[model samples]
Target: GRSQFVPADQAFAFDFQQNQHDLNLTWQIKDGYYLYRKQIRITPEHAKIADVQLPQGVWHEDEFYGKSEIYRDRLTLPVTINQASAGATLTVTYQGCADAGFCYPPETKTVPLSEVVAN
Candidate 1:
């Protein structure tokens, strides 16, 4: 039932790493939830994003978006930085839905240079 569903945040939980050359992100998707590939967006402040290395997703016949590319289980992604300032920050947005029929609004997160730690 709907009561068994978790919050959208928990359904598509994520963590990230900032290496000297790139940024790596990983999402631990709950068993019954899946992420939309086309819904993931990234923006950088005081930095330039050269490229986003996203994996090929499983083809899904979605009810809301027709045929779509979706991700499940653990998803790993990497973004290349072309140039960055000392205090650069990144804004990332993504959306997902549960197999139980609940779809969530897109969630956005910010990563600051101040939070940088050794990977």
Candidate 2:
């Protein structure tokens, strides 16, 4: 195990942004780290999410989760909203790991999907 020098907040902070009907979740991965593709999840707390455009992931034999697809530097996922009104709250769930032998457990955060000004 490596020293707990970097906090998980700075390591892999997940965020939600919407120009979406069209729901979007994005992250800029810190160096020496990668996120699990299968572990990414999004759910609208009050509304239903219709269609999400999740990109295909890169093949990585992750040290933490063997034989998994992962994101290297950045990840963006967009989903279609079903009956979601503007200014609604939503929840995001995700996970990732540092290459220095530390894996962050599944994390969740609630964000206002309609908060971001629609493009």
Candidate 3:
């Protein structure tokens, strides 16, 4: 039996924060929703992105993609920046699916250089 599927934005809550030389992107994946690791892409404007350190994810033999690494619960990606200046921005893209038998098309977002201010 098919279950109700939540909107993609609600299924994967995306956010990011940055310091002088690095950026950290995070997604709070809803229960039963998992993100595909290889489908995640990040591109920068006015800044150079270096090594993107992605955390380990569970290996799943997906019905759609087959033999893929998928992330559940949460995802945190740390990206190193090179020669970044003010007004730098990044275009982020990712894809995910739910256990309720629904797959969301790739979603994209843009994030600007944000100073991580101490509270």
Candidate 4:
């Protein structure tokens, strides 16, 4: 059964910014939910990022993806900048699950930047 107290928007929120010559993304995860650590991806077109840093996550066995690294509460992704291209598009991909046996499909979000992509 799905949680009546939570909607998809309530379950998760994604946001990112470029600061200090780095790209930063944050996942605001609601209670009773977790995110798969291995499934996160960020791609910058026109602009560039050198490497992405994800903090270590709890080792958990997932029904949907076998043994997986999972994060609860909040997750922050820090990406080192290689170049800055303002108004370029960022492709973000991620997946997660609820405590109620529900897994969100892999999501790819295109953020067409209206601002600078690096400090």
In terms of TM-score, the best-performing candidate is 1
TM-score of each: 0.88, 0.78, 0.87, 0.82
Candidate 4 accuracy as lDDT? 0.76
| Model 1, global lDDT | 0.83
Query: What digit string (tens of lDDT, one per residue) describes model 1 on residues 19-100?
Result: 6657887899999889999999989888777778679999887688788899999799887766677888889899998888
- As for candidate 1, its clashing pairs are none
Native RMSD of candidate 2 (Å) = 3.6
Better of 1 and 2 by TM-score: 1
Candidate 3: tens digits of C-alpha lDDT, residues 1-119? 35456888899999987776767899999988999999998888877777686789999876899889999999988887766666867899999998877789999999886432222
Q: Is candidate 1 or candidate 4 better by TM-score?
A: 1
Clash-forming residue pairs, model 2: 21-81, 51-80, 52-79
Which scores better on lDDT, 1 or 2? 1
Q: Write the per-residue lDDT of candidate 4 for residues 1-119, one digit (tens) a residue.
A: 33344655567788878664556778899988888988888888877667777899998886798989899999888776666576677798988888777788877778664444344
All models: lDDT? 0.83, 0.73, 0.84, 0.76
Candidate closest to the true structure, highest lDDT: 3
Model 1: residue 82 alpha-carbon error in angstroms = 2.8
Model 1 ranges with Cα > 4 A deviation: 114-119
**Which of the two, 2 or 4, has more TM-score?**
4
